[PDB]
A paper describes a structure:
They are composed of 24 α-helical subunits arranged around an interior cavity where an iron-containing mineral core can be reversibly stored. [name] ferritins are atypical of those found in higher eukaryotes in that they are homopolymers in which all subunits contain both a ferroxidase center and a presumed but undefined core nucleation site.
Crystals of a [name]/[name]/[name] triple variant of [name], designed to eliminate the iron-oxo cluster binding site, also showed no evidence of either unmodeled density or anomalous scattering in the vicinity of the Fe5 site. Other than the side chains of the substituted residues, the structures derived from crystals of the variant protein were identical to those from equivalently treated crystals of wild-type [name], the structures overlaying with overall RMSD for main chain atoms of 0.110 Å (150 residues). An indication of the individual contributions of the three residues was provided by data for the single variants. Substitution of the neutral H57 had a negligible effect on the rate of the FoC reaction, while that of substitution of E61 was greater than E64 and appeared to be cumulative in variant [name]/[name]/[name]. Therefore, of the 3 residues acting as ligands to the observed iron-oxo cluster, E61 is critical to release of Fe3+ from the FoC of [name].
Author numbering:
A (entry chain A), B (entry chain A), C (entry chain A), D (entry chain A), E (entry chain A), F (entry chain A), ...: 10 to 176
Write the structure that this text describes.
Amino acid sequence: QNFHPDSEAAINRQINLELYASYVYLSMAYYFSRDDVALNNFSRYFLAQSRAETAHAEKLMRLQNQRGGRIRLQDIKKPEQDDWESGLHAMECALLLEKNVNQSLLELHALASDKGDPHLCDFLETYYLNEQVKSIKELGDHVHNLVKMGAPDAGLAEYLFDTHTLG
Amino acid sequence: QNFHPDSEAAINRQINLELYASYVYLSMAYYFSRDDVALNNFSRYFLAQSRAETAHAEKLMRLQNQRGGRIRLQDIKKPEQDDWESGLHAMECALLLEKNVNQSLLELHALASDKGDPHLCDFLETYYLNEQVKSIKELGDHVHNLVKMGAPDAGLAEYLFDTHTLG
Amino acid sequence: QNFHPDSEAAINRQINLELYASYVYLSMAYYFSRDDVALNNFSRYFLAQSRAETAHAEKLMRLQNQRGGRIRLQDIKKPEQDDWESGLHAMECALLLEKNVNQSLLELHALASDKGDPHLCDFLETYYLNEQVKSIKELGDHVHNLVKMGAPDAGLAEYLFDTHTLG
Amino acid sequence: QNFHPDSEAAINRQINLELYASYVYLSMAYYFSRDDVALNNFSRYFLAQSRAETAHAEKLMRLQNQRGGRIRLQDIKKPEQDDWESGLHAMECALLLEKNVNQSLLELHALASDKGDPHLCDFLETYYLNEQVKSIKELGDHVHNLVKMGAPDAGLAEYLFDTHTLG
Amino acid sequence: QNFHPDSEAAINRQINLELYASYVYLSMAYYFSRDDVALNNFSRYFLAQSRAETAHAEKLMRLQNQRGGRIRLQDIKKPEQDDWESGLHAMECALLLEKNVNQSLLELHALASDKGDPHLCDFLETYYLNEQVKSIKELGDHVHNLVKMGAPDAGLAEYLFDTHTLG
Amino acid sequence: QNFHPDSEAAINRQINLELYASYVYLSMAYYFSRDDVALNNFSRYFLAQSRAETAHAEKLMRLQNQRGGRIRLQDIKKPEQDDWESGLHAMECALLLEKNVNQSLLELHALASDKGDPHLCDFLETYYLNEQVKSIKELGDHVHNLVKMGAPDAGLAEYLFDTHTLG
Amino acid sequence: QNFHPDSEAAINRQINLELYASYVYLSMAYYFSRDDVALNNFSRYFLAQSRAETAHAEKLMRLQNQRGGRIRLQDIKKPEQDDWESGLHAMECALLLEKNVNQSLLELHALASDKGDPHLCDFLETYYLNEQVKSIKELGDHVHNLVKMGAPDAGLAEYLFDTHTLG
Ligand SMILES: [Cl-]
Ligand SMILES: [Cl-]
Ligand SMILES: [Cl-]
Ligand SMILES: [Cl-]
Ligand SMILES: [Cl-]
Ligand SMILES: [Cl-]
Ligand SMILES: [Cl-]
Ligand SMILES: [Cl-]
Ligand SMILES: [Cl-]
Ligand SMILES: [Cl-]
Ligand SMILES: [Cl-]
Ligand SMILES: [Cl-]
Ligand SMILES: [Cl-]
Ligand SMILES: [Cl-]
Ligand SMILES: [Cl-]
Ligand SMILES: [Cl-]
Ligand SMILES: [Cl-]
Ligand SMILES: [Cl-]
Ligand SMILES: [Cl-]
Ligand SMILES: [Cl-]
Ligand SMILES: [Cl-]
Ligand SMILES: [Fe+3]
Ligand SMILES: [Fe+3]
Ligand SMILES: [Fe+3]
Ligand SMILES: [Fe+3]
Ligand SMILES: [Fe+3]
Ligand SMILES: [Fe+3]
Ligand SMILES: [Fe+3]
Ligand SMILES: [Fe+3]
Ligand SMILES: [Fe+3]
Ligand SMILES: [Fe+3]
Ligand SMILES: [Fe+3]
Ligand SMILES: [Fe+3]
Ligand SMILES: [Fe+3]
Ligand SMILES: [Fe+3]
Ligand SMILES: [Mg+2]
Ligand SMILES: [Mg+2]
Ligand SMILES: [Mg+2]
Ligand SMILES: [Mg+2]
Ligand SMILES: [Mg+2]
Ligand SMILES: [Mg+2]
Ligand SMILES: [Mg+2]
Ligand SMILES: [Mg+2]
Ligand SMILES: [Mg+2]
Ligand SMILES: [Mg+2]
Ligand SMILES: [Mg+2]
Ligand SMILES: [Mg+2]
Ligand SMILES: [Mg+2]
Ligand SMILES: [Mg+2]
Ligand SMILES: [Mg+2]
Ligand SMILES: [Mg+2]
Ligand SMILES: [Mg+2]
Ligand SMILES: [Mg+2]
Ligand SMILES: [Mg+2]
Ligand SMILES: [Mg+2]
Ligand SMILES: [Mg+2]
Ligand SMILES: [Mg+2]
Ligand SMILES: [Mg+2]
Ligand SMILES: [Mg+2]
Ligand SMILES: [Mg+2]
C-alpha cells in the first residue's frame, strides 16, 4: 500500500550504502589496532560506528519487510583504503562518508515526498536525518581538534586526543 | 616472526569468507521475517548466526594485527539467493555453507602446518575447528528433524519446528 | 549371618544385569543424539535411566559388602543393537528390558524367601520391586502415546513427544 | 568431513577402553568398603575415578556423533582381579592402567596426525592427554608415599594415608 | 487382632535384650573414660550406641501398646565384664553382641512369619533387620582396622583410631 | 612415558630463560624508580612483567615434575644493562627479549614435534605461544607510541605515556 | 647523604644473597613435588619461603633507590643441589642458609655502624634482623621434630610432619 517501486529500489540501494559504511568503519577500527598505529580509543570509536551502521542497515531491511517490499542485497564493496594514514585522515574520511550517506538519505526523502509516501518520510526523519546531522557534527568537532592540535605530524596530538576525548 | 606471506594472504581470504557467511545469514534472517514467510524463530536463529560470523571475522582480523600481518579487505559478495524458499532449504544451504567454510579452515590449517606455524594451528584449533564441527552437527540435526516432519510441504512442520526447537 | 551362598551368587548375577541395563540405556541415549535422529529429550531421558541403573547396581554391591558376601564382577555385555531404529522402538525395547529385569528380581526374591532371608526380601521390596513397577508403567505409558500418535512413520509424532512429554 | 574410517574405529576402541577403566575403578571402590579392608577414603577416591572415566567415555561418544561417525559398543570386560590385595596394590594397578590408557590415546593421536585430522588431535590434546599426565603423576605420588610409609605390611601406613591424604 | 500370645512374649523378651544391649554399651562408654584408658572418642561412640539401643527398646514397647499386648519387664542383667580390656576387645564384644541380637530378631521374624503376622514382620524389617546389618558391618570395619593397626599392643593404634575414625 | 631426554634438557634450558626474563624485568622495574628517572607506571608495568615470567618458569618446572623429568637449575645471568637509558629503550629491549624467548619456544615446539610429543606441543601452544604473540604485540604498540611522541628526547613524551597508557 | 660507597656495594651484595636464597627455596619447593618425593606441604612451605626472599631482595633494591645508590645486579648462582635428599635434609640446609644470610646481615650492620649510618642500621633492625631470628628459630623447631620423629628413615615421620605441622 502506497509503496512505490522506485522507493523499494531506493531503499535497497540505501541498505547497501549503510552496509558499506559499516565496512569502512570496521576497516578503520582494525587499522588503529595495528602495532604501528596503536591508538586503541580511535579503534574502539570506529568499531562502535561500524556496529551502528549495521543497525542502520537492519532498520531499512525491516522497513522493506514491513512495507511488503523485497530486499535485494548487493555486494558490499571494500573500503577505498586499507591504510588510513593517521587518526586525522580517518576522521576526515569518516566525515566525508557521513556527508555522502546524508546526501543519499536526503535524495531518498525527496523521492518519498514526490511519491506521496509520508510513512517513508517520517521513517527517514525519525531514525536517519538527525542521526546524520549529529554524526557529521561530532566528526567535524573531532577533525577540528585534531587539526588545531597539530595532527598528524605533532607527535603528541593523536595520542592525547585518543586518551582524552575518545577514552 | 614465523609468519609466512602465504599465511598472511590465506588469513585475508578467510576473513572475507567469514564476512560472506555473516552476510548469508543476515539475508536468511530477513527472509524469515517476510509477511509471506513469518517464521520469527528461524529469523532470530539466523540473525544470531550472522552475528557469530562477524565475530569469527573479527578474531582473524585481530590475529593479523597481532602477528604483524596486513589486513587486506575485499568486496563481500552478496548471497547466492534472496528468496531462501523454505525453512528446510535455508537450513540445508547453511549446512553446505558451514561445510565449505570448514574445508577452507582445514586447508588453512594444512598450510599453517606446512609452514611450521604452531601458533596459527593452535588458533584455528582453539577458536574455529570445533566451532565448525558443532555448527555442522547442529544444522544437520535441524535438517533431519525438518525432513522427517515433512517440511516444506507439510503445513505444520516448519511452524512447529519454529515454535518448539528454535523458540 | 543368614546369607546363603546361592543368594550371594544370585546377587552377583543381579549386579551384572543392572550394569547391562545401564549400558543399554547409555547406548540408547547416544543413538538419539545422532545427526540423523536428533531427538534430544529422548536422549536425556535414556541417559537419566542409564545413571539410575548404575545406582541400582551400586546398591546391590553395597548390600554384598554389608552382608559379608564377595562381589564377583563379570563382563558387561554390549546391548543387542547399536541402531535403535526409532523413538518408539527404543521405548519398546526398554519396556521389555525392564520386564526382564523385573522377572530376575522376582526370582531373586523367591530365592531369598526360600532361604529364609527377610533382610534380603525387604531390601528388594524397598528399593527394587516398586521401582520396577513404576518404570514398567511409565514406559508403557510412553509406548502407548507413541503408538497412538502414529510413531515412527507419522513425521510429527516422535518430535512432538520429544518436545512435550520428555521435554 | 575429514573423518577417516580408521579414526572412527579407533575412537570406538578408545570408548571401550574408557568404559573398562571406569569398571576397574568401580571394582576397586567396592573392594575398599569390604568389612576386611574398610578404607573408606580409598573407596571414595576410586569411586570418583570411576565416574571420571565414564565421563571420558561419554565425551568420545559425543565426538563420534558430532563427526558423523557410528558408535559401535563392545562388551566391557571385567577387571583383572576382584581382590585388589591392598591400598598400595590398587594404586599400583591404577597407575599401570592409566599408563596403558595413555599409550592408547597417544597411538590414537598418532593415527589422527597421520590422517591429517587436526580436530581430532586437538580434541585429544584438550581433554585427554594432559588429564592422563596429571592422573599418572597423582597416582605416582600416592604410590611413592604408600611405599615409603611401609604399606601394605606396616599396619599404620594405609590407615594413615586414607585418613590424611585421601580424606 | 492377629497378635499371637507367643509373639507378645517374644516381643517382651526382645525388649529386655535391647535394654541389655543399651547397658553393655553404657558400661563400655564409661570404661573408655577411665583415667587408665582415656579414649574419649571410643567413649562417645559407645555412649551413642547405648542411647540407640534404648530407642530400639522403646519402639518395641510402643509396638506392644499399639497391638494391645501387655509389656512385661524383667531385670536388666549387668554386662559380662566391667573391665573391657582394650578398644579392640570392646569392639569385638560389641560385634558379638550385635550378632546375637540379630539372631534373636531373626528368630522373632520367623515366629511372626509362622503366625501369619505381616505387621510384625514389616515392623522388624523396617526398623531392626537392616539397622543390625549396618551395625554389624560398621563394627566389623572397626575391628578390622584396629587389628591391622596392631591394637591393643601397638601403642599408637587405639589412640590413632580414636582420634581419626571415631573423632 | 613419551618424554625424550632431549626434551627434558630443552625444558630445563627454557626454565632458565624464563627466569632470566624475570630478572631483566625486575632490573627494569627498579631502574624506573630511580630518583633520576622516576616513572612509576613504567616501574609497575615492568614489575608485573617480572612476576609473570616467574610464573612462566614455574609452569615449566611443574611440567618437568608431571612428566617425570628432572629439573636441573643453572645460574640466572644478570641482565645486559643496569642503566636502561630511557622508557623507550627499555621497551625496545623488552620487545627484543620477548622475540628471543619466542624463538626459543618455537624451537622447543619443533623439537617436541620431531619427537612425537603432542602433550608438550599442546602445553606450549596453550600457555606460551599465544602469550608471547600478545606480549610482542603489546610491546610493539608501546614502542610505536613512544617513538611517535618523540621519546626519549621530547621532555613530555615518556611522562605522558607513563601517566596515560601505563597508569 | 651519609651513604658510604662501601655501604652501597654491601647492599648490592646483600641483594644478590637474598635472590640466591629465593632460588634455593624455589628449588626445594619443586623437589618436594617430584613423583618420588610427593610431600606437598613441604613444597608449599618452601615456595612461601622463596617468595619471602624475593620480597627481602626488593626491599633492599628500594633502599638503594631511596638513598640514591646504584643497584648493580649480579648472576644469581644456582643452588648447591638439585636433589635435596629428604624433608629433614632440606630443612637442615635451609637452617644453614638462614644462618649464613644472618651473618651477612650482621656484617652489613657492623659496616653501617662503623660508617655512622643510623638509617641503614634501623632499616636492617626493622626488616631483617628479627625476621632472621624468627626464621632460624622456626627451622630449628622443624629440624628438631623431624630428627626426633626418626626422619628420613622412619617411613611415617616426614609424611606425618607434612600433614600435621606444615599442613
Ligand atoms: Cl539532537
Ligand atoms: Cl572533539
Ligand atoms: Cl606535539
Ligand atoms: Cl564440543
Ligand atoms: Cl534439532
Ligand atoms: Cl502437517
Ligand atoms: Cl508408587
Ligand atoms: Cl506418556
Ligand atoms: Cl504426523
Ligand atoms: Cl596441568
Ligand atoms: Cl600423595
Ligand atoms: Cl606402622
Ligand atoms: Cl543400607
Ligand atoms: Cl573403620
Ligand atoms: Cl604403634
Ligand atoms: Cl588472543
Ligand atoms: Cl600503546
Ligand atoms: Cl615534548
Ligand atoms: Cl618476635
Ligand atoms: Cl615444628
Ligand atoms: Cl615410622
Ligand atoms: Fe548510517
Ligand atoms: Fe553514519
Ligand atoms: Fe565462521
Ligand atoms: Fe559458521
Ligand atoms: Fe534396575
Ligand atoms: Fe530399570
Ligand atoms: Fe580415561
Ligand atoms: Fe584414567
Ligand atoms: Fe538394638
Ligand atoms: Fe545394636
Ligand atoms: Fe615468558
Ligand atoms: Fe615474556
Ligand atoms: Fe632473606
Ligand atoms: Fe631467609
Ligand atoms: Mg593508545
Ligand atoms: Mg572493486
Ligand atoms: Mg513532513
Ligand atoms: Mg516527524
Ligand atoms: Mg552516527
Ligand atoms: Mg512464528
Ligand atoms: Mg556478483
Ligand atoms: Mg591445542
Ligand atoms: Mg556456528
Ligand atoms: Mg529435538
Ligand atoms: Mg557377544
Ligand atoms: Mg526406573
Ligand atoms: Mg577408614
Ligand atoms: Mg574374560
Ligand atoms: Mg584422572
Ligand atoms: Mg583421646
Ligand atoms: Mg548375674
Ligand atoms: Mg546400631
Ligand atoms: Mg610518574
Ligand atoms: Mg657474566
Ligand atoms: Mg598440533
Ligand atoms: Mg607477557
Ligand atoms: Mg603429602
Ligand atoms: Mg657455578
Ligand atoms: Mg623467614
